[PDB]
Each structure stands twice: as structure tokens, then as C-alpha cells.
């Protein structure tokens, strides 16, 4: 099985799982630990944001590769936004302070 770009989940905005439906492999926690054990920082950010969650990042990366530029815009993962909204649905306020 192999996938470059296909359908994504409608809630977490992440690629689907399985072979019957076009889906990508899961970069689990253990793989993230292995990348952290290396000097893999840009690779990890690429795994987390530009390929899985950041829709704008995904589109920009696709366009940049199409035109021949291998540059990334990490952006903001959608999964963290979903988690923030879920936590805010309770009686708990959470926000990203700027200062």
C-alpha cells in the first residue's frame, strides 16, 4: 500500500486509516520518540503538521513541490484546535496567550 494525498477525516482533518480506503501509515508515539532521539526536528514538524493536520500547510507544501520549491509552512495543526474547543466545551477556559 502507498499513499501521497487522498481523503481526510472530517473531524480531526487527518488522513484515513486502512488499505480498503486510501489512507496513510500512522506515525505513532514510538516513532515520534525515535525522531526525538535523533536530531530530527524539521522532520518531526513535517510529520506532525505539514502532512497530517495543517490543511493550509498541506496545500502550500503541495503547491511548492509542484512548482519545485522544497519549503514548508508549519502553520497550526487542526487537532490541537479541536482539543482546545473540546476543553472549552467544559467549564474550563484555555487560550494561547501572546505576551
Amino acid at each position: 500500500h502507498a499513499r501521497s494525498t487522498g481523503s481526510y477525516s472530517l473531524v480531526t482533518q487527518q488522513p484515513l486509516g486502512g488499505k480498503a480506503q486510501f489512507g496513510g501509515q500512522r506515525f505513532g508515539e514510538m516513532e515520534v520518540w525515535a525522531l526525538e532521539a535523533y536530531g530530527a526536528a524539521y522532520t518531526l514538524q513535517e510529520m506532525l503538521t505539514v502532512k497530517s493536520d495543517d490543511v493550509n500547510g498541506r496545500t502550500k507544501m503541495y503547491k511548492n513541490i509542484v512548482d519545485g520549491n522544497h519549503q514548508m509552512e508549519p502553520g497550526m495543526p487542526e487537532s490541537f484546535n479541536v482539543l482546545l474547543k473540546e476543553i472549552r466545551s467544559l467549564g474550563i477556559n484555555i487560550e494561547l496567550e501572546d505576551e
Binding site: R3, S4, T5, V32, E36, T43, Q71, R88, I92
Partner: protein, 1318 residues
């Protein structure tokens, strides 16, 4: 974009601000209309338009519901400890019996007798109403709790509670009040208010996060969130209608209780009562269920996620591949590199639009293969196996396009992947940025990884066929073809072998030239004639120039090949080592194929001497059984003898079979016979180390030996049949027991290993190297570890790749041997070992002075590269992975009277006081005396511990030979050793009241036995037994050097045989006191969790004399009285805990009072951080070495430092920290340094030891603790305390989605910090 994340409980105004509308109707979607209703859960007028690049408002716009009556938040009520109950200082039972309308609570006491917070039931309520009525206020429900919270004021309550704590003395009350004070202070320093803890406005999630997907059959999904919201809306609307109708108390009370229950179920289903059951007969998924747990958002979509540009396929051996190359299927590569192919096609102009690009791609035009070859020329791909146990689980390779559907993997990397070719699958990821390709080529490339980061051992070794091929090539017969000729060089030998004129094993003499490295660094050639074999000469052609010829002039087994590769790496470098490894693999494969080695039924030769030995063993077992029938031997000893004789028979059979196998080949030389090493394929495989060991070959050819039934015992009759022969039904059935035991063990080990690895990663994820040198002179003293007869770890292994903490003095000369701050590489280790150095002080991570990380010098070598560790290394993650990787190799199932000297050297004694007995032998009157076997070089060769009242064969400072006994003792009972010779008399233990008289079994002597204090009456327990040693003048003679006279107080159950008035010598025995862990992975888990043992060892907190007292109820009380200090110290010890120390002895700090396992917390408290670190690393290393696993102590020290991160204050000083507060040690250090700089006085602190889970949960960053586990409690505490979290970590940045400050992102984070500071 942002710097930190703030979490706090939400006020109703903020909740209203979030919402873009009010939800009033519980109508999600009409089935017929397909249009959401107004004011519904999916209303377009509230959450934005359904349709329009994308409608992101529906994903972010929230709603709100105005609750008719206030409802308590379940998280702040039921999550222990209860925030509302702690804040109100009221037991939780009253709290949720008032919230759910079962009892009334007073708010305003007024002039009435009842106080403010009282619980009144119905009868009490109307009794108070009739008796007083008037103006007192007693309310019911959640609004009552809200009013109670609003009425209270935090400032005066906190100040009065602090002033009470200043004048309080109760320890439990001290802890309760310090917790309450901390809670009140956290509430008052934040903008949060207690009244906000009671919900009045309910937030509503955006519809897109709880979508109603179509089922393509006319119906929809479940959407448990929508169901819970609908139930809450129904309850709220019913309550509103009831209030508008002016309902009686009972109806509104029931409706409010049901609404509160519905709100609780929506917030946390099943938290208090029974969970709401949906259409699937199972609890519905609440809001809290989608945050916590393994299936929650944190562990399923933030820490890990599915990624594009990835694929998966089975693996296949590529023998032709290079070390940096891997075979990729053409279809998989074409699918993965589609955007690159589009870009190249558009750049070269074969298509006008990208649609035309896909149209050329999927049709598979001829030029598409050329484009794909161009785009993958230098594009590394990351190959990863499913269990990523350690760092080497994912590696970068250069793709080579192949035909098929299977990924071709280089054999030499398989050991790194722990992958075998029997159905395993690997996943391939394609980096698609320049930075990622750079780190794939420079960091994750297979050529870079040559040494294991866990211990520094090489990871690329030949395993199965290369070893066999090299072993066959490098071997010699005595009469092979072409033997004795002289060859001009290796090329002539290769030509002769290929032409068939000379055999591969022919012993010839060839002229070879070898290059040696001189001082200046170049290569000098030396040509000479060497007697070798044709195969060795052929193999010499792939060896690089710098290596000598002695490496290949041998049999070249697995160990020899590994040593040759290590020498090549050490002498030549890295790239020549890679080329040499590839050539070695190629030659081994080729010559293994050419050899044609095969396994046949005749290879496993069975000797008849084995059958004779088996028959003799049967005869011996029959004789033993006949002796047992005679009744001269019991069952246990006869079973032991049977087991021993069967083991001896199995050993004899194995020895005979091995002797037959190794030298079976008796071949003829030119004149006569000669016995040489056999060429049996099984024997060659066993000897070369390619596959199999002595035990497996012995099972194949000799008897299988004894087998154990599942309970752990050994069966009397072993399996006397080989695998070549026919095992009967009994033998197979017996072997199935062990097979099933092992299979179940390896099936159930994985879950615990993974859990331990996850905990270790989470406890040490944020530790990185941030500085270069602390400048601290404090370190740890490393010495070789010896436990009675063996030196397990030499000093060289322990101190390799570690910087020194102080100037190492040369022994006996007082001259410095190494500088103070030098890294101990191989040359320094050789210098240390050649100068007879025993103990070396080296800087350690656990003593690193750098805050928020560690320094490079205090860590040491990288352990994966020759140079020192680099700044930014994620040493914590590497340490956790290194510790957790060998977890699957451990086990879980739970299954002396003299000292023997084996070496020659002097004997030294430590912390010993002793006395010469009547015979002149030394008897030790100490409890912790240690003996060391110091060799002629001064090294501590052996270490032993002697017990109380142990005789010594010879004194200190004398040389003894091996095999001699130097100390003897009786472990059955502990003796009492006297120090003064004189008449012995009895005092205060007359018979019948406190002691008893017992007749001897056969001698008939009447011996006095000290009765137990509980057993004896009150008239005897008041006094204590006293043996008094008196001189000629009449009274008790004082001990030399001590004013307190020599009277011995007999402990319980003491037995004395000699009568009073009998003269005794010094060192004699007065009384005799009767004297009475399994699993590897569980032991490691307990050690890393700091779990208190079930039978903790009692230790002396302070140094001083010991005394007894009252027996209290049924367990003894102990008093520790120091000579100079005061005597407030009393302990509470049970009878069943043995008392190692007697009544009239002197003990020091951290002395062993009761035998048993030592609690790590007590060790840390009484001996310091270094002692507990040494204990933990020793235990972990022992457990790992029991299974033959080599792990460096740096990782264990890193973990230990991570555990020790909190300290409890003792003296407040000028600091603002509370007396009972437990705060991060770095904060205390910074505050103390600032106070010392300002001239004030610091705060005394005591470091505490926490388990891995507790340490990870109790961290500054609440996000990491929430993502680890126990999300509800962590989130509740963070919201209540209003914690602000700066990421400054690996897990936090991974969850957020930014660069981790470890690798290439460390410089970026440093630049960001500098910009923020400036």
C-alpha cells in the same frame, strides 16, 4: 505566534462571550426536510452558514445554553480531592447530599444557635422553621452551594488559617491546613472565583466537531454528544416550564435534580451514578471520554497521527544492495513521489497542465519511469518497523527501483530493525523538504548509525550466512590439493582456486604486503612471505591497506569478524569501514553459496557411549529407589540425588557427543593418519557462531535433559531421547509445559514492557543538554562492583567515556595522574588501569548544577560517536529508549556459614571493632563489619559481609592463599559477645514472672529462656533481664572507655545455658537469639517506581544510643538517644520485625535495625542523593545483567535525576515558600542563590524521591501531565490553580506543532528566547 498557554475555570460571562447564539430546541436534523431546525443543535443562525475556501466558522463557532437552575460541575466535585469540599472545609458526603436535594444547608447563621455550615435534613429543617423561623437562611441544591461559595471571603479565611497553622502542632492537621492554604492562595492570586465553580451557562461544541454523518440509507449516525445535549436541553426546557408554572417544592426539586444528573452525564458519563445507555447497550461517549484515555485526543491525534506520503509493504533480502541503499517497488515509489513527478514533468515541459501531468502519470508512459528515476536519485526514504523499541527502529536509505511488490532490505541492518524475513512488514516515509532530506542524509542515514547509543557496541555484524562463508573460506586441511606451493600473491591464490588446481583449504606460503600506520600518520609498506591458506589469501584482497595481516590468518568466526571490523573502524575511519563491511558481506554470501553446506540426518551423529551412560544412570536410579524402599533416605534427599545423577549423566552425554563431533575427521596426510577439526556442517555452524549454540546442538544430538513442570519443580525422569530420535508421547507432553510457559511469558511481557517504556519516556522527555560546563567539583565515586567471588564490571567499563570530577592522584606517590576536567577515553582508561587505580570520582548527571537541563561535561561521551556529547542532545528520550528496549528480554513469572577465599592477597577490615577470644581468634562485636581481599596491586578483588559474633581465622593485614576459610559463623542463631572477662551474675529476671525454665531434650539441663513481654504478665514485663559481668572486687566492671557499666540486657526469647557465677573469658558467648525477590521486569518497574517494599527495613534516622520502653498495645516502642543532642526520637516497631541491634548498643545514621529490603525514600533521607542513586543503578544493572544485557549507567542516572526533582521546605527563611510546600528543586536553588546574592538567608530544603508516574504527573507543564495519563485530575488542578504553561519541552512542542528544542530546532529555540529577552 504565541509564547505560553493559560488554563483557568471559565466565568459565565466568558462562556456567553464564546457563544454566537443560544440553543433553545433539541432538534438536530429533520429526516424528511434535511434542514436543521431553528435554535437547534445544528442551527445555521447560531453556528454559521452550512455552506459557503471552506466553511471553517461551523468548526469554531460555539453555542451556549442558559440553565434554569445552577448545576455543580462534576469535575470540580467528584475528582478526588474535591475542590468544592476542600474550599468549603466540608466533607464530600454533605456536599453531594445537598447538591442532589437530600439535605438542607444553612447559609446565614444569624443570631440562632446553629452555625454557618450545618446540614439539616427535612425533619431538622421544619423543626428549625417552627422553633425559630424568622430570618435564618437554609437553602437546598446547587444554588445553595453557589451562595455558600460566594458568601465566603478568601483573604481573611486564608490569613486566619495561616495564623492557626503557625500555632498548630498536629501533623495530619498540618498537612490538611497546608493543602487548604495552598488552595486558597492559588484561588486568590488568580482571577478565578469560587462561585464560578458552579455552572450556570453551558457551552455547546461546534456542530462540525460532532457531525451528523449520513448513513446512505435514509438514517444518520449515533452522535452520543448530540444525544446528551438533547437530554440536557429537554431537562432545561422542562425545568423552565415548571418554574413558569409556579410549581410546588417537590416537583421543581425533582426536575432540578434530574437536570443536574443530565448535566453531569454530559460532562462525565458514569462519573457518579450509572452511565446513560444508548442504542448500543453501552455507555455514551461524554466530553471527558474524548479527552482522556488511550483513545482520547491527546494520545490518538496529537502525540501521534496518520501521515501522507507513507506506505507499507513486506520486506525481502537484498544481497546486492549497499549499506546505504534499499530496494523500493516501482509502483510504491511512483505513488509516493507523485507531486515530484508532476513538478519534473512541468519543468521539462512534456505537459501543459497538471491535469495532463496526472494523465501521463497513471497511464504509465515510458518517460514516467525516467522521471521517477531522476526524482529518487538522491532522495532518502525513512524505513520503520512497527515496534519502534529504540532509536534505530527508523533509518534513512537511498531508494533503488525494483520490480515487484516487496521492499528489499539490506541484511546488515536487520539486526538494527530486529526484523526477519518471514512475513514482517515495514513502513516507508518520504521526506519532502530540504531540511528533512538533510537530516535524513546526515542524522538518520544507516551509515551514520554504527554504534548502539545504549552501550556503544557496534550494531552491524554478520549474522547467518556471511559468518559461515568466511569461516569456510578461512579454514585449513592437511592434504588439500595444491598444498605446499609458493604463490606470488593473493591474485595467484584466487586464480588457482578458480582454476581448480588448488583447494580453498590448502596450506601454502604466499608473499603479501601489509601497510602500517606510523607516528606521522601515513602508511609504510612491508612485504613478507607468510604461511597461510588459499582462502585467507583470497579474503586478504578486500581488507583495506591500514589493517595488518593477523586479522585474516585464523578461522575467522563471528567474534573474529566483529573484532576485525572494530579494528578497521578504530584505525581507518567510517567510510572504509562501510566499504569493508559491504565487501565482507558480499564475499561471505558468495563463498557460502560456493561451499554448498547442507544439513542431513547423518550430520547429527549420536554416540553409543551416550546409550551406555543412560543405562548406567538407569542402574543408579534403580539403586537409589531400592535404597529409598529400604528406608535409609527420605523423599526430598532421594529426589535431589536423582536430579543430580541425571544432570551428571546429561553432562557426560553432552561431553561425549561434543568430543565425537569436534574431532571426528581422521584423515590421511601424505604418509599416515592425522586427527583434525571436523568439517561436519552442524559442527561448523555451531563453532562459527553463525547459528545455534552448545545447548541446541546438544538437544539435537544428545539427550534433552531435565524438564520442569509448570509450577517450577523439576521432574525426576528427564527426556533421554534426541530430536533426531523419536520422542514418545510423555516426553512431548512434558516439553509442551515449558514451551507453553515460555510462549505465554513472551506474549504477556510486551504490554508491561511498553507501559514501562512509555512511563520512562514521559518522565524524562524534557531533559536535554543545554550547557557545556557547570564548573562543579562534586561527582560520584565509581569503583568495580564485586559480590562475593566475581568482579562483574571492571572500572574501565564504568568510567569509559566520562569526565573526571577531581584530580586523580597516583596511588602511593601523591602525584596527579589525570587532569581535573579531562574526558576518560581509551588512552586515559589504559593509563588508569596500568597504574592500579580502584576508585575514580567522575562528574554525573544526577549532580549536574545546570537548571532546566544538563551540561555536556556532566554527561560525558555521546556513546554513539567518539567525540563528547553535543549541546541539545535529547539525552532523556535516548536514555528511556535504551532502558526500555531490552524489556522484552526479561522475565516475569515468579519461580552459608563460612567465608571462602579464592585469590591470594592481604585482608582488610572496614568499620570493624572486635576482640580476641580465649583461643586468640578474633570475634567481631559489630553489625556492619566488612572484609575486603586487597591484592598486591591494592585493588579490591573481593568483598564480603560478616555477621554479628563471627570468628576470624586470622587477623587483618596478613596474606592468605586461595581455598582457605577466614571467617566462620552460625546463621541459625545470633550469639552475644562479651568484651570483659569476669564472673557472670543474674539480675532482675528471676524465674516464674519474666522468664521460664526449660528442660533440655536429652541432656536434661534446665536452661532459662527469656519469656516474651506479651506472653509474660505485668509483674515481669516491668523489669528487664540483666547479665552482669563483675570483677573480683564485687560490683559490675565498666567497659574500658565507657563510664556506663557492662550489664547486658537480654532481648526476647533469649536462651542462656551457662549458670551464674561462672568465670568467662573475653569474647565468649552469653546468649543465643534464635534466627529465622523474583522477576526481572516487575523488579525494574518497582525500582523505577520507588515502590515501598512490603517489609521495609527499619533504619536509624539519627545517630545515638538505643533504648527500649513500654510495649504499648502489642508492638514495641523504641527510643534513640544521642550522646550530645536532645532525645525526642521514638519509633514504633512490631514484634515480628527482627531486632538486629540489642538494647545497649550504639548506632549511627542510616544503620540497619531490622533486616529486610531498604526503602529508597529512607536511603535518600538518611544517606543522601548519591547513595540512593548508587543503589538504584546497582539494582537496575544487576537485573539487566542477569539476562546478559549491557546498558550504560548514564541512562539510569538520567532517570534517577528525573525522579529527584522536588523538595519540601523545612525553614521558610526570607523566601516566600510555605513551610510544608513541596516545590521544584530548581526553583528552591534559584531562590536561595538570589537571596544569598541579596544578602538575605535562604530556605532549607529536603529533596524527595517520587515514582516515574508521580514525577511525570507532578511537573510544571500541565499539558505534558495531562497527555501522560489522569487527564481529568491534572486538568482540574490546572484550571483551579490557573497554571500558565510555557512549552520549553519536547512533548509540549510536539502537541502544539512546533520544532522541538533538541535537534536542529535547538538553535531556533535559543534564538527565539534571545529575541524575547531582548
Amino acid at each position: 505566534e504565541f509564547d505560553a498557554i493559560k488554563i483557568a475555570l471559565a466565568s459565565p460571562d466568558m462562556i456567553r462571550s464564546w457563544s454566537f447564539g443560544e440553543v433553545k430546541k433539541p432538534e438536530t436534523i429533520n429526516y424528511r426536510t434535511f434542514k436543521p431546525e431553528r435554535d437547534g443543535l445544528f442551527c445555521a443562525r447560531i453556528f454559521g452558514p452550512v455552506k459557503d475556501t471552506q466553511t471553517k466558522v461551523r468548526r469554531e463557532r460555539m453555542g451556549h445554553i442558559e440553565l434554569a437552575s445552577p448545576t455543580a460541575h462534576i469535575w470540580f466535585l467528584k475528582s478526588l480531592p474535591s475542590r468544592i469540599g476542600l474550599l468549603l472545609d466540608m466533607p464530600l458526603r454533605d456536599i453531594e447530599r445537598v447538591l442532589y436535594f437530600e439535605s438542607y444547608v444553612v447559609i446565614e447563621g444569624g443570631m440562632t444557635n446553629l452555625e454557618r455550615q450545618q446540614i439539616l435534613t427535612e425533619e431538622q429543617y421544619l423543626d428549625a422553621l417552627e422553633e425559630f423561623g424568622d430570618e435564618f437562611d437554609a437553602k437546598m441544591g446547587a444554588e445553595a452551594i453557589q451562595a455558600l461559595l460566594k458568601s465566603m471571603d478568601l483573604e481573611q479565611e486564608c490569613e486566619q488559617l495561616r495564623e492557626e497553622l503557625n500555632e498548630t502542632n498536629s501533623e495530619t492537621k498540618r498537612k490538611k491546613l497546608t493543602k487548604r492554604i495552598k488552595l486558597l492562595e492559588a484561588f486568590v492570586q488568580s482571577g478565578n472565583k469560587p462561585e464560578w465553580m458552579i455552572l450556570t451557562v453551558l457551552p455547546v461544541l461546534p456542530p462540525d466537531l460532532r457531525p451528523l454523518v449520513p448513513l446512505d440509507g435514509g438514517r444518520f449516525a449515533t452522535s452520543d454528544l448530540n444525544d446528551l445535549y438533547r437530554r440536557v436541553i429537554n431537562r432545561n426546557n422542562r425545568l423552565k416550564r415548571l418554574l413558569d408554572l409556579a410549581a410546588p417544592d417537590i416537583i421543581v426539586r425533582n426536575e432540578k435534580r434530574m437536570l443536574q444528573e443530565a448535566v453531569d452525564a454530559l460532562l462525565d458519563n458514569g462519573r457518579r451514578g450509572r452511565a446513560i445507555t444508548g442504542s448500543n447497550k453501552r455507555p455514551l461517549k461524554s466530553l471527558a471520554d474524548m479527552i482522556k484515555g488511550k483513545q482520547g485526543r491527546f494520545r490518538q491525534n496529537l502525540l501521534g497521527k496518520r501521515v501522507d506520503y507513507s506506505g507499507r509493504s513486506v520486506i525481502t533480502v537484498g544481497p546486492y544492495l549497499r549499506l546505504h541503499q534499499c530496494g523500493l517497488p516501482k509502483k510504491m515509489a511512483l505513488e509516493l513521489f507523485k507531486p515530484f513527478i508532476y513538478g519534473k514533468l512541468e519543468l521539462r515541459g512534456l505537459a501543459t497542465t497538471i491535469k495532463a501531468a496526472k494523465k501521463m502519470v497513471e497511464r504509465e508512459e515510458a518517460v514516467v519511469w525516467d522521471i521517477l528515476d531522476e526524482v529518487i536519485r538522491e532522495h532518502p526514504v525513512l524505513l520503520n518497523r512497527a515496534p519502534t523499541l529504540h532509536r534505530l527502529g527508523i533509518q534513512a536509505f537511498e531508494p533503488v527501483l525494483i520490480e515487484g511488490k516487496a521492499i528489499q532490505l539490506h541484511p546488515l541492518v536487520c539486526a538494527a530493525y530486529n526484523a526477519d524475513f518471514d512475513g514482517d512488514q515495514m513502513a516507508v516515509h518520504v521526506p519532502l523538504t530540504l531540511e528533512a532530506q538533510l537530516e535524513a542524509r546526515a542524522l538518520m542515514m544507516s551509515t551514520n548509525n554504527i554504534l548502539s547509543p545504549a552501550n556503544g557496541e557496534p550494531i552491524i555484524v554478520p549474522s547467518q550466512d556471511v559468518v559461515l562463508g568466511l569461516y569456510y573460506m578461512t579454514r585449513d586441511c592437511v592434504n588439500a590439493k595444491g598444498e605446499g606451493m609458493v604463490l606470488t600473491g593473493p591474485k595467484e591464490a584466487e586464480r588457482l582456486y578458480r582454476s581448480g588446481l588448488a583447494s580453498l583449504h590448502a596450506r601454502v606460503k604466499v608473499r603479501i604486503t601489509e601497510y602500517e600506520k606510523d607516528a606521522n600518520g601515513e602508511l609504510v609498506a612491508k612485504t613478507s612471505l607468510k604461511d597461510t591458506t588459499v582462502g585467507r589469501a583470497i579474503l586478504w584482497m578486500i581488507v583495506p591497506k591500514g589493517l595488518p595481516y593477523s586479522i585474516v590468518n585464523q578461522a575467522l568466526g563471528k567474534k573474529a569478524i566483529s573484532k576485525m571490523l572494530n579494528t578497521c573502524y578504530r584505525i581507518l575511519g567510517l567510510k572504509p569501514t562501510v566499504i569493508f563491511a559491504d565487501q565482507i558481506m558480499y564475499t561471505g554470501f558468495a563463498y557460502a553459496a560456493r561451499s554448498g553446506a547442507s544439513v542431513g540426518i547423518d550430520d547429527m551423529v549420536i554416540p553409543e557411549k551416550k546409550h551406555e551412560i543412560i543405562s548406567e544412570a538407569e542402574a543408579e536410579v534403580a539403586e537409589i529407589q531400592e535404597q529409598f524402599q529400604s528406608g535409609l533416605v527420605t523423599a526430598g534427599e532421594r529426589y535431589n540425588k536423582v536430579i543430580d545423577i541425571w544432570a551428571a549423566a546429561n553432562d557426560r552425554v553432552s561431553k561425549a557427543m561434543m568430543d565425537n563431533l569436534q574431532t571426528e575427521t581422521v584423515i590421511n596426510r601424505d604418509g599416515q593418519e592425522e586427527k583434525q577439526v571436523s568439517f561436519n556442517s552442524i559442527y561448523m555452524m555451531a563453532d562459527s557462531g553463525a547459528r545455534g549454540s552448545a545447548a541446541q546442538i546438544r538437544q539435537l544430538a544428545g539427550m534433552r535433559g531435565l524438564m520442569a513442570k509448570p509450577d517450577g519443580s523439576i521432574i525426576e525422569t528427564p527426556i533421554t531421547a534426541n530430536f533426531r530420535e523419536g520422542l514418545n508421547v510423555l516426553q512431548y507432553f512434558i516439553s509442551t509445559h515449558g514451551a507453553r510457559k515460555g510462549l505465554a511469558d513472551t506474549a504477556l511481557k510486551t504490554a508491561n514492557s511498553g507501559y514501562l517504556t512509555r512511563r520512562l519516556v514521559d518522565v524524562a522527555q524534557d531533559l536535554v543538554v543545554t550547557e557545556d560546563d557547570c564548573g562543579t567539583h562534586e561527582g560520584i565515586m565509581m569503583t568495580p562492583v564485586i559480590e562475593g567471588g566475581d568482579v562483574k564490571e571492571p572500572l574501565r567499563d564504568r568510567v569509559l567515556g566520562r569526565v573526571t570530577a577531581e584530580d586523580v592522584l597516583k596511588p602511593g606517590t601523591a602525584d596527579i595522574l589525570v587532569p581535573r576536567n579531562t574526558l576518560l577515553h581509551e588512552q586515559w582508561c589504559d593509563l588508569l588501569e596500568e597504574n592500579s587505580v580502584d576508585a575514580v570520582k567522575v562528574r554525573s548527571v544526577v549532580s549536574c548544577d545546570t537548571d532546566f537541563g544538563v551540561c555536556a561535561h556532566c554527561y560525558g561521551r555521546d556513546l554513539a560517536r567518539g567525540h563528547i556529547i553535543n549541546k541539545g542532545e535529547a539525552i532523556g528520550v535516548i536514555a528511556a529508549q535504551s532502558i526500555g528496549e531490552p524489556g522484552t528480554q526479561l522475565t516475569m513469572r515468579t519461580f552459608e556459614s563460612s567465608i571462602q577465599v579464592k585469590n591470594k592477597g592481604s585482608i582488610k577490615l572496614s568499620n570493624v571493632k572486635s576482640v580476641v577470644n580465649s583461643s586468640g581468634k578474633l570475634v567481631i562485636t559489630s553489625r556492619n563489619t566488612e572484609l575486603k581481599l586487597i591484592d598486591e596491586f591494592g585493588r579490591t578483588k573481593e568483598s564480603y559481609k560478616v555477621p554479628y559474633g563471627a570468628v576470624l581465622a586470622k587477623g587483618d593485614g596478613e596474606q592468605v592463599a586461595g581455598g582457605e576459610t577466614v571467617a566462620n559463623w552460625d546463621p541459625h542463631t545470633m550469639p552475644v559477645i562479651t568484651e570483659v572477662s569476669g564472673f557472670v551474675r543474674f539480675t532482675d529476671m528471676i524465674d516464674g514472672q519474666t522468664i521460664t525454665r526449660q528442660t533440655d531434650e536429652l541432656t536434661g539441663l534446665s536452661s532459662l529462656v527469656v519469656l516474651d513481654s506479651a506472653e509474660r504478665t505485668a509483674g515481669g514485663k516491668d523489669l528487664r533481664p540483666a547479665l552482669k559481668i563483675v570483677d573480683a572486687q564485687g560490683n559490675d566492671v565498666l567497659i574500658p572507655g565507657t563510664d556506663m557499666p557492662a550489664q547486658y540486657f537480654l532481648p526476647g526469647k533469649a536462651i542462656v545455658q551457662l549458670e551464674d557465677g561462672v568465670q568467662i573469658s573475653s569474647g565468649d558467648t552469653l546468649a543465643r537469639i534464635p534466627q529465622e525477590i523474583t522477576g526481572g521486569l516487575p523488579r525494574v518497574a518497582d525500582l523505577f517506581e520507588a515502590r515501598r517494599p512490603k517489609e521495609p527495613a527499619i533504619l536509624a534516622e539519627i545517630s545515638g544510643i538505643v533504648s527500649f520502653g513500654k510495649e504499648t498495645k502489642g508492638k514495641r516502642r523504641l527510643v534513640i538517644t544521642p550522646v550530645d543532642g536532645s532525645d525526642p526520637y521514638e519509633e514504633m516497631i512490631p514484634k515480628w520485625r527482627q531486632l538486629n541491634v540489642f538494647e545497649g548498643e550504639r548506632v549511627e545514621r542510616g544503620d540497619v535495625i531490622s533486616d529486610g529490603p531498604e526503602a529508597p525514600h529512607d536511603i535518600l533521607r538518611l544517606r543522601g542523593v548519591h547513595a540512593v542513586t548508587r543503589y538504584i543503578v546497582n539494582e537496575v544493572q544487576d537485573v539487566y545483567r542477569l539476562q546478559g544485557v549491557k546498558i550504560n549507567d548514564k541512562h539510569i542516572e538520567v532517570i534517577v535525576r528525573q525522579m529527584l526533582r522536588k523538595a519540601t521546605i523545612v525553614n521558610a527563611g526570607s523566601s516566600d515558600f510555605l513551610e510544608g510546600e513541596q516545590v521544584e528543586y530548581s526553583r528552591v536553588k534559584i531562590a536561595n542563590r538570589e537571596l544569598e546574592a541579596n544578602g538575605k538567608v535562604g530556605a532549607t530544603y529536603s529533596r524527595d524521591l517520587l515514582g516515574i508516574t508521580k514525577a511525570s504527573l507532578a511537573t510544571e507543564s500541565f499539558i505534558s501531565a495531562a497527555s501522560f495519563q489522569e487527564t481529568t485530575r491534572v486538568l482540574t488542578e490546572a484550571a483551579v490553580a490557573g497554571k500558565r504553561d510555557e512549552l520549553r519541552g519536547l512533548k509540549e512542542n510536539v502537541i502544539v506543532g512546533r520544532l522541538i528544542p533538541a535537534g536542529t530546532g535547538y538553535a531556533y529555540h535559543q534564538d527565539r528566547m534571545r529575541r524575547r529577552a531582548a
